């Protein structure tokens, strides 16, 4: 199998900044019939794969011509001469030449952008679980930068840290940021039983952790 | 681009046996050949093989070879992959793709699993206390204790597609939790309603809930 190597693995850009992504076969990707079969693939988290380039430089429909490929026999390189937003997501370079067609382990491209400070958001649990005996407490951290974030719950000033299911969206095709979502889930009695309920993040963005309190019987 | 239908999510046991389809609606696949590309949560793309669906002729992969499949039925414009003797290993997302303008099928997750299907409860999240951000509303949606993956989450039947922030399933005890919030002017929300579209493919589970006003929390 000819092996397919990509250089970085990782690609951290400025918004704005020329990018390259290299890809090196393992043996020559010229066929007899003179063509190279090498394409290069994009895929955004969670969607199906779509294709940028074809026969190492033909650019697909559609695909900018901030994007180029060029290379021949064992090194390819894609160029983005300047990167946008909505260049985040995996890039792969992928080769038909030989049998079995192999692929590249993908470029992970991020941008760097400035600072962003989360927004924070608390929902009590709807009557409907509480009906049903549940209830979760729902904390979302909205369009913050960079991706690391912490929180913590405290309820009635107590932090609690049994229960809590956190996930992470990927960078924003638009924005570039990211967003998080930390539920702590209880029972209707431990819920009814207290009063406070607070999330609470620590960001690089402040000194001190931006808290949001929700208190029963209030609003 | 996403041009093709493949078949919903598969839960299947360890050691059985499945059969992915891959169809069009606007065009005869036999004319382009169609190939399957796998991939296990959070790693690359791996090609299976390729078919030339109108006489059934197929190379598979060495790694497939006997583990996989291929056959294409021209009468009901349908290809597929049939997959034996399954593993842990083999759960992942099942892509077809067709010769033919880089056309895509949208992905089959397949869960080899012997838990049980569990369809979800699905909850609305009406904010408190009158919160806004400069003048703006968000809304929420709680996907909870489904098993197993996909859920599609859509917002006003996918019309409201802008300022929405779908996050990735957790799994915890055999059980996933997935939430999504929609971001919305104040002028909208609650004068125009606001609907959290909710679909469990494996259990064929559909659910609407519509984000009310709360009452005194």
């Known amino acids: 199998d000819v092996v397919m190597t990509q250089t970085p693995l990782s690609l951290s850009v400025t918004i704005g900044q020329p990018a390259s992504i290299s890809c090196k076969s393992s043996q020559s990707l010229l066929d007899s019939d003179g063509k190279t079969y090498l394409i290069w693939v994009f895929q955004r988290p969670g969607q199906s794969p779509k294709r940028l380039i074809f026969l190492v430089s033909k650019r697909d429909s559609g695909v900018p011509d901030r994007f180029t490929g060029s290379g021949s026999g064992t090194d390819f390189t894609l160029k983005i001469s300047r990167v946008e937003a909505e260049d985040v997501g995996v890039y792969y370079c992928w080769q038909g030449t030989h049998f079995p067609h192999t692929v590249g382990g993908g470029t992970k491209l991020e941008i760097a952008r400035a600072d962003a400070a989360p927004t924070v958001s608390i929902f009590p649990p709807s009557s409907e679980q509480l009906t049903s005996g549940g209830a979760s407490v729902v904390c979302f951290l909205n369009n913050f930068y960079p991706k690391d974030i912490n929180v913590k719950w405290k309820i009635d000033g107590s932090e609690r840290q049994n229960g809590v299911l956190n996930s992470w969206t990927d960078q924003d095709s638009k924005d570039s940021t990211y967003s998080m979502s930390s539920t702590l889930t209880l029972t209707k009695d431990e819920y009814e039983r207290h009063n406070s309920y607070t999330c609470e993040a620590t960001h690089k963005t402040s000194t001190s952790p931006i808290v949001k309190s929700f208190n029963r019987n209030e609003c | 681009k996403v041009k093709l239908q493949q078949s919903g999510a598969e839960l299947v046991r360890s050691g059985a046996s499945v059969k992915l389809s891959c169809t069009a609606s606007?065009?005869?696949?036999?004319?382009?050949?169609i190939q399957w590309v796998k991939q296990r949560p959070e790693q690359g793309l791996e090609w299976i093989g390729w078919?030339?669906?109108?006489?059934?002729?197929?190379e598979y992969a060495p790694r497939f070879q006997g583990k996989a499949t291929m056959t294409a039925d021209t009468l009901s414009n349908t290809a597929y992959l049939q997959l034996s003797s399954l593993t842990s290993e083999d759960t992942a997302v099942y892509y077809c793709?067709?010769?033919?303008?880089?056309?895509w099928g949208q992905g089959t997750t397949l869960t080899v699993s012997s838990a049980k299907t569990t369809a979800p409860s699905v909850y609305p999240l009406a904010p408190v206390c009158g919160d806004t951000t400069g003048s703006s509303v968000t809304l929420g949606c709680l996907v909870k204790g489904y098993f197993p993956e996909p859920v599609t989450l859509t917002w006003n039947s996918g019309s409201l597609s802008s300022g929405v922030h779908t996050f990735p399933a957790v799994l915890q005890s055999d059980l996933y939790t997935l939430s999504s919030s929609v971001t919305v002017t104040s002028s909208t929300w609650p004068s125009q309603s606001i609907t959290c579209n909710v679909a469990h493919p494996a259990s064929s589970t559909k659910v609407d809930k519509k984000i009310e006003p709360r009452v005194t929390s």
């Open positions: 793709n067709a010769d033919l303008h880089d056309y």
């Open positions: 606007g065009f005869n696949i036999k004319d382009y050949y």
């Open positions: 078919i030339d669906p109108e006489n059934g002729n197929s």
